[PDB]
Amino acid sequence: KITPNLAEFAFSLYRQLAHQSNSTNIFFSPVSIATAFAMLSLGTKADTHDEILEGLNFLTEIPEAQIHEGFQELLRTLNQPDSQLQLTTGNGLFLSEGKLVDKFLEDVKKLYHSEGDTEEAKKQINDYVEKGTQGKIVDLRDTVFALVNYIFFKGKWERPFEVKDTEEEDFHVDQVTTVKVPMMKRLGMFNIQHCKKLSSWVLLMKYLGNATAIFFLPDEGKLQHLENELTHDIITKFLENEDRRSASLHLPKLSITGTYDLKSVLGQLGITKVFSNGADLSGVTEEALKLSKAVHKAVLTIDEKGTEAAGAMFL
Amino acid sequence: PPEVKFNKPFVFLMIEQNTKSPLFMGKVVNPTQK
């Protein structure tokens, strides 16, 4: 219902994070960030309200109600997996007992299933972040109002690799640097194809359950061409499939972390009224409020058995 | 061309089946950078 705008946001956010610097690894969670600012979208007043929905690529043809309820069916569908893969999302809101409007409370309790001393608050927040993510995000405090969200992912490959064919092969970093990483090896039938619009190989490996990973191997020099012409319409076309060829797959194992504070990037996406003095947060409190930072952290793990990822957001 | 090696920097998506929304997106340039 809101997934086409959700992928466009994931790509708009991806471009600026990658355009900022292409010299390091990138890993973030679009759903966690989207829910964080969509949760705040219910407690914000005009001209900050609007910039928030527009910054999530939403106003034009959809009402504000149908947007918030898309996220309740979103988070309910994700928090209800047919458990072969482990997937859970959690929303937190750490108030400090002053003043609340209590209409913001009823809205976030319904739509998003949400649940001074610096040391006590810091330890309490990070335990809530480390509890749901199974200790993946452990070390992710300013003032009265804090909103936190977390996601946990743990799936297994439909056709797992064997841990004897994983040989250490070269990895081309920048046409001068070459590092050796443990690459997994497997032959057989794969859901692989060529775009002819992206100049890149597109490989889909489905996880056991309701999840699927897509891998884009760009041609020589076409890495930037891939990042610019990658849209929602093309991935849905790729997800309509079962044209499977056969090839030998060399997939490297992975373990990386994102750790982005992104107050600056969102301004480039239209959310400028985020930490502004003039920014209006009236649906939240009756005493008065503004944001100071927006930190996002996410970890990834790829092995022969499956994938284990977890992301968190702190506003 | 059955020689698909991921020895170059690449981009990956991690999308849910039933919801069709991307849960994770990333770009791998160096696996050793952990």
């Epitope: 841990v163 004897k164 040989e167 | 050793t32």
Partner: antibody
Framework: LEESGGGLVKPGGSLKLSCAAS????????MSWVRQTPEKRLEWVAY????????YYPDTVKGRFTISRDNAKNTLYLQMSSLKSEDTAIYYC????????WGQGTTLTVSS | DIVMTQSPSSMYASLGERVTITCKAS??????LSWFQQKPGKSPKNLIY???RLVDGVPSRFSGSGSGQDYSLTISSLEYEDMGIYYC?????????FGGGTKLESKR
Amino acid sequence: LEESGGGLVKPGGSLKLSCAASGFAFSIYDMSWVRQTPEKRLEWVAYISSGGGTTYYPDTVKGRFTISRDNAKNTLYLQMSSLKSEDTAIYYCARHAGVHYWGQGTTLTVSS
Amino acid sequence: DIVMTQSPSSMYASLGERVTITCKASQDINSYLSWFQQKPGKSPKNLIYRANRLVDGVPSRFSGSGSGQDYSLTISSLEYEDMGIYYCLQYDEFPWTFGGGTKLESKR
């Protein structure tokens, strides 16, 4: 990767070895312990996959030795218990992805 | 449990001479065999993995072949930095067992 913690242990005692590592990820490689008996016979001791699952043990040491990872501090562990005279050997911590590289070892001496 | 028989247990050779040692398994191991070298005062170093693919950094003097149950290590032109004990590794199935070891010594 440089391992340490060896020494002399009385029969029936216990000891825990450590293999700290730097220069590579250590969170992406499989780790293992391998020993070298005084008779110059090498034999596999432990095998932990990457992350923590799943550990493998031969029947000679199953139930007595326990391998564990600490990827946060980049340290491999080998909890030894119920040691016998056969356990006296030079132990090695090994990272393997097809090719594996061993440390310089640490000597365990189990005698009364 | 696959027993790895390695022959011979000890042999002499001279500089530049061709040396060939063999490692036979108790069963088929699908060519998952690795060859090690140990200096007397230092730790084993990996030379070959998958029984025909050299480890990066090893001189091209070391060859190796074999299939199923009989595998061999060959040095085309022996050197003085190659004298030591050679071990053959089995990693086709758990537990991973090694060979008895081949002692390569210098002759004069």
